[PDB]
Every structure is written in structure tokens, then in C-alpha cells.
Write a protein that binds this ligand. Structure first.
Ligand SMILES: Cn1cnc(Cn2c(=O)nc(Nc3cc4cn(C)nc4cc3Cl)n(Cc3cc(F)c(F)cc3F)c2=O)n1
Ligand SMILES: Cn1cnc(Cn2c(=O)nc(Nc3cc4cn(C)nc4cc3Cl)n(Cc3cc(F)c(F)cc3F)c2=O)n1
Lengths: 299, 297
């Protein structure tokens, strides 16, 4: 049981470089549109406090250099949708996959294709934290990198990377250009709200640990849903809903451990700590696996 | 600090499925040759004690079903090299990347493209353990999945997946079909050797912490390499090689911390513990990040 990302080939074929002046970052080339963060129109003075509509109206199509590998694409039009700039180019991407734009919910996961100057560099899994940040691995030049899920060869794009926060966590937008979270595309120190743990995911990962032959954390006790949620909230875990209990059904079915039995197990781990032991080789309670991620990998 | 796979597209367009009778697994299509585990020529009753020489003699080109998706690639020649079958097909793969076949050493990491019936399903980074297993994540139908590194658009293939072991770890070969470790391609109960901690990678991890300002564990001591190797084995850590000291060179230069000074630091952590302090926010020493991985991140 490992963190596993989707195969990234369908997305790699879509990554390009966008440059405006000296400012440069990654864009996503779908059919005859390149999507990228609007931040690319900013000079370094602009970045500190940008008025984007005002900066964009003073831009021309020829102010935009788009490179797909070694070839240049000619921008024939441009517009802005919230924090995303849409560059119309004169050539369709012939490797455009079947795709959708989706906005994911906190707790859901997606694969990140990290890119630098339009070249893909790595791929890994992230989750949308409950405070709408993600804990990724991004360096300078990764602006415009995208997150995505793939189901039956259709790519669902859900994240476009924008900035690193002072705490090292990451903030971005969906592909309509709305930020996840209360952030803005400005170069100024921004804090996130207090983060909490994705409870249903921790439960999924405990089930994974059982499917993989580890049970030291299980106990005899059971709890009620409300009594478990009291303890969870006390430890800054998100509440567990009855929908979450239902989503965990197959994993309870497969292992024969009732969900509220697993909750009783998690409750004790939260109160008594891990006492030095490890679950799936981790010393902390892992919360970036969804029930689907666990199912997809154990079956 | 995350485990990061290489982008997988160059390898995705090389994955095919190979079927013999009802036995089906994954193969790798490069130019006009498909490479796959020879275990594919086994029926159920052959997998326990297969006679690969006598099984290949009953076989003709027309016994091999090779498919890119649902498209058949006609097999025009077949031969065995160690534990991999090489199938000559009538079509050169137009998406063949610039590639090499390499044999990796324990501690080196690589990306695994897990596949089922010729269809990629996931990608993740693995380290080769000192007992020549990998802590993979593989389901049934993953035989023939490959592991790789990508350097400047060149794909270096280093691993082809064959089997899961009772302990739940995995074993395979290089792309010339030579197993890593003391395993053989039979459906027999084989046990991984006792594993050890990858010392060069723990050191890389310590350099990563120092680069990030987390350096409490640095001490005023130094050691010789032989002295350190003899003590590391007593804590079930791998001894360091001359090549290991050299790939730590860039990190040693970046931080100004001599490789042997960092060994003395680790030796002190081995003999006394972390005493309740963390390194990169962790109480445990990570050993699956190589020095190259550390600098890449
Ligand atoms: C350390 N880190 C982790 N993730 C990131 C992503 N990131 C980025 O890649 N680039 C940024 N600013 C730029 C500077 C440029 C210099 N040149 C020549 N071209 C540049 C292009 C960019 Cl985008 N930023 C900062 C940043 C980007 C934003 F989109 C934003 F709204 C606010 C910000 F403060 C950045 O975080 N770096
Ligand atoms: C759970 N798991 C994790 N890794 C693996 C890898 N693995 C595999 O995918 N398949 C195997 N045996 C086959 C059975 C088949 C049934 N049909 C219809 N077709 C089949 C093809 C194969 Cl390869 N094995 C077992 C195995 C494969 C070998 F190559 C070998 F030398 C010895 C072995 F015991 C397997 O481990 N499964």
C-alpha cells in the first residue's frame, strides 16, 4: 500500500510554456486554448499588488509567447476567467484528451504533474486539505502545474497551482480560476485557516492497514457516531457523517470490521497515542487516502 | 518532502499485453521487440515447477498474442534470454523513446508504472531494498510492469516485475531477465533475506534536513569509513561503498558538511536515539530518498 498517482501521459502532452515580458510559467493546452495563471501578465512590481483587469487591458496578443516543446504557438486571442487567463492559439493540440473541469471537495485526492518551464518533472498524489491548501512538492517555476483524476481515459482537471504560502503549503485554483480557499493571486504573505484532519480518510487508511495484515490498533470496544464525533472534534478531526459511514461500507464488508468499531479503534489511537508503533510504516495517522483510493489499490 | 515519480507517458506508450493460452501479463514494446516475463508460457500446472526450455520448444510464433490495446501485433520471432521472453513483432513502436537497460544497486530508487493486462493504472516511486526486494503496490495481473528513471528524455529501464513474496514484498529482474536477489521465476514459496537500512539514503535525508535549517544532530565528531561501517552493521544498517561516498559529494559540498562528519552524526543517532526530537518533522529516519532525489527536491 503506497501513495499512487494516475499515469500522466495524457496530461504531459498538454503542458506548455507561457511568457509575458520576463515573467514565465506553465500552461495547459486543450484544443485551441491555453489555460494558465493570470499572474503571468505581472512584472515583478505588478506582482506585489496587481490590478488584473487594468493590466490585461494594456496587453496585446503578441505580448504572449507560448512554447509547446520547441515549437511556438501564435496567440490569436486572449481573455480572463477569474484567476485563469485563456489564450486562444492558432493550432489545436492534436493530443487533447477527453477531459472535464471539476471542482473537488476537501478530502478528495488528485494527481499532481509538477512542471517547470513547460517540461513535466514529476507526478505525485495530493489531497485537498479541509483548509483548502495542499501539501505538495513545488519549486520556483511550477506556477501553472495541474492536478487531475483519470476515470476511463477521461481526465478531470481539478487544480492549477499558483503559490507557496509562508508555511510551505500550496494554494491554487480550479480551472474556472476560482481559488480553493480564501487566498488571492498576489505576492503577499498569506496564512491559511487552521487545518484539521480528514477523518473518513484516516478510517480508510486503517482499513487498508487491516487488508495488508496489520491489526495491532483494533480493539473490542464500539462507539456511537455522536460519541466518536465528540472526541474527533476535540482533536481537530473533521466530523464523520452518515454518508461517510456509507462510503466506508465496502471496506467494512471486505474486512468484516464495522465502521463504528474502526471509529472506536481510531478514538483510542487519538487518546492514547501510537506508543511508538507504526501503521503501514508511518508514525502518524495518514489522512490523504480516500476510501476510493484504498479500494482501487486493494482490489 | 514527498516521494515523486517521473512522468510516465514515455513508458505508457510502450506497454502491451502478452497472452499465451490463458496466461496473460504485461510486456514492453521498444522498436520491433516486445520484452516480458517468460512465465507467460506457463499454464496453471506449469507455474509450480516449470521447465522453460521444454516449454519454449512446444511454442511457435503463432502461439503468442501481443496486443497494443485491442490491436494485435504479429509475432515474427521469439527467443528467451534468462527470465525474459523477447518477441520480435512486425511493427516498430513509433513512440519508442531514447532508452537504456540498466541494472541498479540496492538503495537506488525508480518509478514503477503498475499495469494490468497491458493497461497502465498507476505510478509511484520505489527503492530497491538491500535484500533485493521492493516494497511495491501490485495486484494480480501486474507481472511485466516495469520500473524506470528518466534523465533528459532518456528512459533507463531497471526493473521488470515478476512475483510477490509471502511477506508481501515484490521481486523481479532487470531488462535482460537477470533476477535481483536470490529468486527464480517459479510459483514456489521464496522468502526475502533479512533486510537492512539503506545508510547512504539516511545520510541524504540528513543532508536534506540540514539544507532546510534542521541541524541539531550535527556534532563535533568525525569518523573513518571503516570504523563507521563496522558500527553500522551492528545496528542493521548497510555498510557504505566508495560509490556511496561519492554520490553524497554534491550534498556535502552544498552544505559544507564532510561526508565522514555526517556519518559521525548518524552514528550518534544510532547509539543514543533521537531522545524525543524530530528530524524534518519525523521521529523515524527515512531511507528511500537517494542523494539525487534530495537534490531534485
Ligand atoms: C517556491 N515555490 C513553490 N511553488 C511555487 C510556485 N510559484 C511560482 O512557480 N512562481 C511564483 N512567482 C513567479 C516568479 C517569476 C519570475 N519569473 C522570471 N517568472 C515568474 C513567474 C512567477 Cl508565477 N510564485 C509566486 C506567486 C505566484 C502566484 F501565482 C501568485 F498569485 C502569487 C505569488 F506570490 C510561486 O508561488 N514556488
Ligand atoms: C498480488 N500480486 C502482486 N504482484 C503480483 C504479480 N504476479 C502476477 O501478476 N501474476 C502472477 N502469476 C500469473 C497468474 C496468471 C493467471 N492468468 C490467467 N495469467 C497469469 C499470469 C501470471 Cl504471471 N504472479 C505469480 C508469479 C509470477 C511469476 F512471474 C513467477 F515467476 C512466479 C509467480 F508465482 C505474480 O506474482 N501479484
Amino acid at each position: 500500500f503506497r501513495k499512487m498517482a494516475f499515469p500522466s501521459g495524457k496530461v504531459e502532452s498538454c503542458m506548455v510554456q507561457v511568457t509575458c515580458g520576463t515573467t514565465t510559467l506553465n500552461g495547459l493546452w486543450l484544443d485551441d486554448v491555453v489555460y494558465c495563471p493570470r499572474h503571468v501578465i505581472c512584472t515583478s512590481e505588478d506582482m506585489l499588488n496587481p490590478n488584473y483587469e487594468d493590466l490585461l487591458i494594456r496587453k496585446s496578443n503578441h505580448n504572449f509567447l507560448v512554447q509547446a516543446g520547441n515549437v511556438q504557438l501564435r496567440v490569436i486571442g486572449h481573455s480572463m476567467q477569474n484567476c485563469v487567463l485563456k489564450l486562444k492559439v492558432d493550432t489545436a493540440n492534436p493530443k487533447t484528451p477527453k477531459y472535464k473541469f471539476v471542482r473537488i471537495q476537501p478530502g478528495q485526492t488528485f494527481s499532481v504533474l509538477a512542471c517547470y518551464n513547460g517540461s513535466p518533472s514529476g507526478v505525485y498524489q495530493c489531497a485537498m486539505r479541509p483548509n483548502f491548501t495542499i501539501k505538495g512538492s513545488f519549486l520556483n517555476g511550477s506556477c501553472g502545474s495541474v492536478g487531475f483524476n483519470i476515470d476511463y481515459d477521461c481526465v478531470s482537471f481539478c487544480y492549477m497551482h499558483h503559490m507557496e504560502l509562508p508555511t510551505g503549503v500550496h494554494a491554487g485554483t480550479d480551472l474556472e480560476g476560482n481559488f480553493y480557499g480564501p487566498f488571492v493571486d498576489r505576492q503577499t504573505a498569506q496564512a491559511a485557516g487552521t487545518d484539521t484532519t480528514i477523518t473518513v480518510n484516516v478510517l480508510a487508511w486503517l482499513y487498508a492497514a487491516v487488508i495488508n495484515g496489520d491489526r495491532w490498533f483494533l480493539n473490542r470496544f464500539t462507539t456511537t457516531l455522536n460519541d466518536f464525533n465528540l472526541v474527533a472534534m476535540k482533536y481537530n478531526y473533521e466530523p464523520l457523517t452518515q454518508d461517510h459511514v456509507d462510503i466506508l461500507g465496502p471496506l467494512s464488508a471486505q474486512t468484516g470490521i464495522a465502521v463504528l468499531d474502526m471509529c472506536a479503534s481510531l478514538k483510542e489511537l487519538l487518546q492514547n497515542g501510537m506508543n511508538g508503533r507504526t501503521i503501514l510504516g508511518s508514525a502518524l495517522l495518514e489522512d490523504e487516502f480516500t476510501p476510493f483510493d484504498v479500494v482501487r489499490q486493494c482490489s
